[PDB]
Write a protein that binds this DNA or RNA. Structure first.
Ligand SMILES: [Zn+2]
Ligand SMILES: [Zn+2]
Length: 42
DNA sequence: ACGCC
């Protein structure tokens, strides 16, 4: 199971989501980096 | 279980 990193529903990932994507990161939400690069960690 | 309007 998964939760989307866009709309945030369950049973699909951001790729599989209907909706268009968000800018910057998705995890924390900050720009410059993407959620794979993201490493803020509090 | 994951990105590129
Ligand atoms: Zn979604
Ligand atoms: Zn981030």
């Amino acid at each position: 199971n998964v939760k989307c990193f866009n709309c945030g529903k369950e049973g699909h990932t951001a790729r599989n989501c209907r909706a268009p994507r968000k800018k910057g990161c998705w995890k924390c939400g900050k720009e410059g980096h993407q959620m794979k690069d993201c490493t803020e960690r509090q």
